[PDB]
Ligand binder design. Structure first.
Ligand code: HEC
Ligand SMILES: CC(=O)C[C@@H](c1ccccc1)c1c(O)c2ccccc2oc1=O
Length: 461
C-alpha cells in the first residue's frame, strides 16, 4: 500500500498539513493511485480515492470496511459508546434498533414527517419575527434541526427560548467551535500532546457529561410515564427494548448506552443539517435565477396556503435538484467519518491489517469530473436530464455509503426539503451586499467544511 515515505515522528504532516487536508489527498492520489498510505504521526492510514475504490470497499467489501476508525483526540474526548463511535455487536445492535425507530411511522401514532412539518412552521414563525431586517441565520437555522431531534427523543419540541433548549444548543455549539479549530489536528499527529494540554478534551468530555446527565433526567421522567403499548419517542422505544431483553442479558441496551446514543444523535443530527441549511440560503442568495425557478415550482405544486410535504418532492424535480446540488457542491464531510477494517483484508493486491484506519474521500466522488462536468461549480443541471426531470446519480454520496451510511439520511433529506421549501414559500431572500460580490467557496478547517459569514433579509411574499 504505497504512499509518501513519512519523516521520523512527524509523519506526512509536511505534505498533508493541518489546513485543507482534503485537497492534499486529491493531489496525493494523482501520484500514488486510488489506494494509498498516509501517516498521522506514527498512525498508518489508508486513503481510498475514486468512486470505483470507494464503491468496492464500502459496498463490495461492506462488512470488512464497516468498522469505525477513531483518531487520538476523538478517543480521549469520548467516554462511552452509542452508535457513532461503536464497533462490533454493540454497534450492529444499537444501529439496527435506531434505524428501526427512525422510520417515518416507527414510533407510535405521530410520524417523523409530522414532527418535521411542525418545526418548519415554527422556523417560519421565527424568521417572521426578524421583521425583514439584516440577519445572521446561523442561530435560527441551528435551532430547527436540534429541535427535530428533541422531538424524536423527548416527544416534545421546545420553544426556541426555553432555557433547557438553549443550554443544550450552547453545548452542541461549543463542541463544534472546539473541533473546528485547526490546531486540533496537532493532537492527531502527536497524541502525547493530549497529556500536556488536556484543556481540549477535558472540555469536550465535560460538555458531553452535561448533555448525558440532562438526558438522564429525561429518561427518568420517561421510566415513570411509560405506557408500554403506546411508545411515543426514541426513549420509550429504547426503554421497552430493554424489557424485551430483560432475560437475555449481559445486553447492549442499557440506560448508559441510551444516554450515549441520544447524544450521538444530537451531535450527528444538528451541526451538519444546520450548516447545510445555512449554506443553501447563501447559494440561493448568490443565484437568484435558481431561487426564482424553485419558487415557480412551489407556487404551482404546493399552494401558498398549505405547508409542504414529502409527497411534493416527486413533482418538484428542480427543487430536488437544487437541494442535491447544494449537498454535492458543499462537500461538508470531505473525508466522511474514519472507517477501519474489521479483519485482515486483501484489497486490490494490497494487504491491509485488521484495525487499520481507513479514510474515504467523499470529495472525489461528489466532485467526480465525468459525472459532474464542471464539479467545482454550483449547477442544478448536474441532477437534471434534458427534459427537466430529476437525474439521480450513484456519485451522490454526501451521507457516505454502505453499512455505515448516515443513519439520518432520511431525516436529513426531510429537513432540507421541507425547511427550504417552507422558507422560500413564505419569504424572498434579499442580500445587503449584492450577489455578484459575495464568495460561496467552502472554508475548511480540519475535517469539516463550512460557509463564510453572511447576512440576508427574509422578506414576506
Ligand atoms: C439522526 C440524526 C442525523 C441527521 C439529521 C444527520 N445525520 Fe449524519 N450521521 C448520523 C449518525 C447517527 C451517524 C453515525 C452512523 C454510524 O456510525 O453508523 C452519521 C454519520 C454520518 C456520516 C458518516 C459516514 C461514514 O462513512 O461513517 C456522514 C458522511 C454523515 N453522517 C453526513 C450527514 C449529512 C451530510 C447530513 C445532513 C446534511 C447528516 N449526516 C444528518 C445521524 C444524523
Ligand atoms: C475530532 C477528531 O479528532 C478527528 C475526527 C475525524 C473526522 C473525519 C476524518 C478524520 C478524522 C474523528 C471524528 O469526527 C469521529 C466521529 C465519530 C466517530 C469516530 C471519529 O473519529 C475521528 O477521528
Amino acid at each position: 500500500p504505497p504512499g509518501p515515505t513519512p519523516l521520523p515522528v512527524i509523519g506526512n504532516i509536511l505534505q498533508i498539513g493541518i489546513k485543507d487536508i482534503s485537497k492534499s489527498l486529491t493531489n496525493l492520489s494523482k501520484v500514488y493511485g486510488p489506494v494509498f498510505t498516509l501517516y498521522f504521526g506514527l498512525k498508518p492510514i489508508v486513503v481510498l480515492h475514486g468512486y470505483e475504490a470507494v464503491k468496492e470497499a464500502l459496498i463490495d467489501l461492506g462488512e470488512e470496511f464497516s468498522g469505525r476508525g477513531i483518531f487520538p483526540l476523538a478517543e480521549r474526548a469520548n467516554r462511552g459508546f452509542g452508535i457513532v463511535f461503536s464497533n462490533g455487536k454493540k454497534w450492529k445492535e444499537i444501529r439496527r434498533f435506531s434505524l428501526m425507530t427512525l422510520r417515518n411511522f416507527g414510533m407510535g401514532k405521530r410520524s417523523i414527517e409530522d414532527r418535521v412539518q411542525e418545526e418548519a412552521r415554527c422556523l417560519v414563525e421565527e424568521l417572521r419575527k426578524t421583521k425583514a431586517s439584516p440577519c445572521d441565520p446561523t442561530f435560527i437555522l441551528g435551532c430547527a434541526p436540534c429541535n427535530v431531534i428533541c422531538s424524536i427523543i423527548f416527544h416534545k419540541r421546545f420553544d426556541y427560548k426555553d432555557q433547557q433548549f438553549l443550554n443544550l444548543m450552547e453545548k452542541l455549539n461549543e463542541n463544534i467551535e472546539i473541533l473546528s479549530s485547526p490546531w486540533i489536528q496537532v493532537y492527531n499527529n502527536f497524541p502525547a500532546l493530549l497529556d500536556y494540554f488536556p484543556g481540549t478534551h477535558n472540555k469536550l468530555l465535560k460538555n458531553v457529561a452535561f448533555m448525558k446527565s440532562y438526558i438522564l433526567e429525561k429518561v427518568k421522567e420517561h421510566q415513570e410515564s411509560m405506557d408500554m403499548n403506546n411508545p411515543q419517542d426514541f426513549i420509550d422505544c429504547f426503554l421497552m427494548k430493554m424489557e424485551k431483553e430483560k432475560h437475555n442479558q449481559p445486553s447492549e441496551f442499557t440506560i448508559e448506552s441510551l444516554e450515549n446514543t441520544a447524544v450521538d444523535l444530537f451531535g450527528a443530527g444538528t451541526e451538519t443539517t444546520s450548516t447545510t441549511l445555512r449554506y443553501a440560503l447563501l447559494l440561493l442568495l448568490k443565484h437568484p435565477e435558481v431561487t426564482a425557478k424553485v419558487q415557480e415550482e412551489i407556487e404551482r405544486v404546493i399552494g401558498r396556503n398549505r405547508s409542504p410535504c414529502m409527497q411534493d418532492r416527486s413533482h418538484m424535480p428542480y427543487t430536488d435538484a437544487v437541494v442535491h446540488e447544494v449537498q454535492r457542491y458543499i462537500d461538508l464531510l470531505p473525508t466522511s467519518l474514519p472507517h477501519a477494517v474489521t479483519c485482515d483484508i486483501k484489497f486490490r493486491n494490497y494487504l491491509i491489517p485488521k484495525g487499520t484506519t481507513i479514510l474515504i474521500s467523499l470529495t472525489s466522488v461528489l466532485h467526480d469530473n465525468k459525472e459532474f462536468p464542471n464539479p467545482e461549480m454550483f449547477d442544478p443541471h448536474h441532477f437534471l436530464d434534458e427534459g427537466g426531470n430529476f437525474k439521480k446519480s450513484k456519485y451522490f454520496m454526501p451521507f457516505s455509503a454502505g453499512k455505515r451510511i448516515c443513519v439520518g439520511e432520511a431525516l436529513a433529506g426531510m429537513e432540507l426539503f421541507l425547511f427550504l421549501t417552507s422558507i422560500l414559500q413564505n419569504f424572498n431572500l434579499k442580500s445587503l451586499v449584492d450577489p455578484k460580490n459575495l464568495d460561496t467557496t467552502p472554508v475548511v478547517n480540519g475535517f469539516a467544511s463550512v460557509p463564510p459569514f453572511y447576512q440576508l433579509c427574509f422578506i414576506p411574499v
